[PDB]
Amino acid sequence: EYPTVSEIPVGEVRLYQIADGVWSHIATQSFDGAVYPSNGLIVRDGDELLLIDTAWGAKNTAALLAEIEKQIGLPVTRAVSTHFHDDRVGGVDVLRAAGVATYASPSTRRLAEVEGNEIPTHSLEGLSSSGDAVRFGPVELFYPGAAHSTDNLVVYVPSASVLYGGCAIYELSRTSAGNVADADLAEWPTSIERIQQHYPEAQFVIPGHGLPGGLDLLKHTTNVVKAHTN
Numbered sequence: 001e002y003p004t005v006s007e008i009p010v011g012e013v014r015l016y017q018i019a020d021g022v023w024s025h026i027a028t029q030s031f032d033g034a035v036y037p038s039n040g041l042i043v044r045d046g047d048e049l050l051l052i053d054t055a056w057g058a059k060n061t062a063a064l065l066a067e068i069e070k071q072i073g074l075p076v077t078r079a080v081s082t083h084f085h086d087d088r089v090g091g092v093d094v095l096r097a098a099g100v101a102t103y104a105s106p107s108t109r110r111l112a113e114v115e116g117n118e119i120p121t122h123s124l125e126g127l128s129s130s131g132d133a134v135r136f137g138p139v140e141l142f143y144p145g146a147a148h149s150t151d152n153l154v155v156y157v158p159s160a161s162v163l164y165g166g167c168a169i170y171e172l173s174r175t176s177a178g179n180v181a182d183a184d185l186a187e188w189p190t191s192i193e194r195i196q197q198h199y200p201e202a203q204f205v206i207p208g209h210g211l212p213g214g215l216d217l218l219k220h221t222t223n224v225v226k227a228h229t230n
């Protein structure tokens, strides 16, 4: 029932309802000769929608906006990118062209600029130290410390007990670290520990790629990272 990579041609986007007023969005994109699925989040914010992460590329993000208009019909008014790589900020220009106010931490904005990626317009203050959390409409943003990247944020929806880990959290079936180019393998288990401490009550955990699960994904990810380290 959760859509898989084989079911979503590149350029199409699926919406999956996780709880009332909470959806994931699922897209697919080419990376180094293979196509991968990728998740983001959509959260009802009163009469508006809060978007967490692009759909990995301009074309996919446009399809996401279209699918949202068709299936939900509320405007996306704000978007947060959880780190600076293309699967998270690629498409920010499309969001801005459609009237969406784009946000990310100062760190993410700077790293995106250096990388030559699209740059979210607005900075999110209050997230510069490991353990920092801030409220952002219907969600809490949390910086757990360096993991998949040094800037990676996670997102909690308190009304639904949904934890979106982004690329810091792996799906259960995944045994192999992916692109760990900007990763901090030594810090990553500690950062997961911070997430586990801060959100002990999470009922649903959404990884950056693949199938949703529960808090068991946190331990699974730590095991995989440590294996790539041992």
Ligand SMILES: CC(=O)SC[C@@H](CCCCc1ccccc1)P(=O)(O)O
Binding pocket: 031, 036, 037, 085, 086, 087, 088, 167, 177, 178, 179, 208, 209
């Ligand atoms: C999310 C990651 O692991 S890094 C993001 C890169 C894409 C990563 C896809 C890696 C992957 C490998 C195996 C299964 C799922 C995803 P990009 O810099 O092109 O946005």
Ligand SMILES: [Zn+2]
Binding pocket: 083, 085, 148, 149, 167
């Ligand atoms: Zn990344």
Ligand SMILES: [Zn+2]
Binding pocket: 038, 087, 166, 167, 208, 209
């Ligand atoms: Zn990713």
